[PDB]
């Protein structure tokens, strides 16, 4: 129950899959270059989900060409089209910040079975 729920309900998106920290996801992001509009996929592990309602955000971590990259999105952002979940992770906490210090094999997350 929130004071401003009657405003936010208009912008809440309905096509959001259920996902948790530790899941591997594919975030299809709209990107503009010049006048043409294309979709760029950001594949990585969800490391955190914070907030609520129309202001809830989630962060995805990828390793790209030897450099760690983190990307944070409003869950209900209209700049995303599809979020696709790929694997469920086995994690023991809500926030996976410890992954920021780990590389390679040790950075791997266990899957749900």
């Amino acid at each position: 129950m929130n004071t401003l729920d009657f405003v936010d309900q208009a912008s809440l998106r309905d096509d959001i899959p259920t996902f948790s920290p530790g899941d591997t996801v594919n975030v299809h992001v709209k990107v503009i270059e010049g006048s043409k509009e294309r979709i760029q996929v950001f594949k990585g592990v969800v490391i955190r989900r914070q907030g609520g309602g129309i202001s809830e955000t989630f962060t995805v971590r990828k390793e790209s060409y030897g450099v760690g990259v983190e990307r944070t999105f409003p869950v209900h952002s209209p700049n995303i089209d599809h979020i696709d979940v790929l694997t469920r992770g086995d994690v023991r906490r809500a926030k996976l910040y410890y992954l920021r210090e780990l590389r390679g094999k040790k950075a791997k997350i266990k899957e749900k079975r």
Partner: protein
């Protein structure tokens, strides 16, 4: 003429533009107002409209206040405030008893919002005036946050008026100019104003058409 309405700051949230840009917004309950009095150059020496806002039990209204509402023929309200108008042609647009709603504004209009800023209590000079304070080390003795010198010497042998010092901060009338109204919700009676507005949630604000960008 310069439109305006009384309202309550409900809180802040986030909406998205049609080009998907994020817009921080404060939600203002631009609740119905009633014109309770008209000020005229011939009666009062200036032109203004008096507005009343907010529900109140008649048990709570004091008798001289009830007498003024009764003379206007309207039910009492908690908050009464004037909007100053430049001219009598603008006054002619209002009548006692008339109701005003959020729909006086349209999307993309620029507004000034007036409210009382949050109280900060007795504030030091670092917080209240942005003083740099002093070093945390290198021998500095018990002056880490102290204001330093407050004047010259024998001449003028006194502290000037206006010297910035510690003291009560906040709880001031503040007007934020040229805020964009992102959306008007006629059904909920709400204004979504881009950006911040002064005051705590639940506090009285006055939304007027921007002087500079109106």
């Amino acid at each position: 003429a310069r439109k305006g309405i009384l309202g309550t700051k409900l809180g802040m949230t986030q909406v998205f533009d049609e080009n998907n840009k994020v817009v921080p917004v404060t939600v203002v309950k631009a609740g119905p107002n009633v014109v309770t009095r008209i000020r005229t150059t011939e009666r009062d020496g200036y032109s203004a409209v008096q507005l009343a806002y907010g529900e109140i039990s008649p048990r709570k209204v004091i008798k001289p206040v009830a007498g003024q509402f009764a003379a206007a023929g309207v039910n009492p309200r908690r908050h009464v405030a004037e909007l100053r108008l430049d001219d009598e042609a603008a006054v002619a647009e209002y009548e006692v008893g008339q109701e005003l709603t959020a729909e006086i504004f349209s999307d993309g209009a620029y507004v000034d919002v007036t409210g009382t800023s949050k109280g900060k209590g007795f504030a030091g000079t670092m917080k209240r005036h942005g003083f740099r304070g002093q070093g945390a080390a290198h021998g500095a003795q018990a002056v880490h946050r102290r204001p330093g010198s407050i004047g010259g010497c024998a001449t003028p042998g006194r502290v000037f008026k206006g010297t910035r010092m510690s003291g009560r901060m906040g709880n001031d009338r503040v007007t934020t100019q040229n805020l964009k109204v992102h959306k008007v919700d006629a059904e909920n009676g709400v204004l979504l104003i881009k950006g911040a507005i002064p005051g705590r949630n639940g506090g009285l604000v006055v939304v007027r058409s921007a002087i500079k960008r109106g």
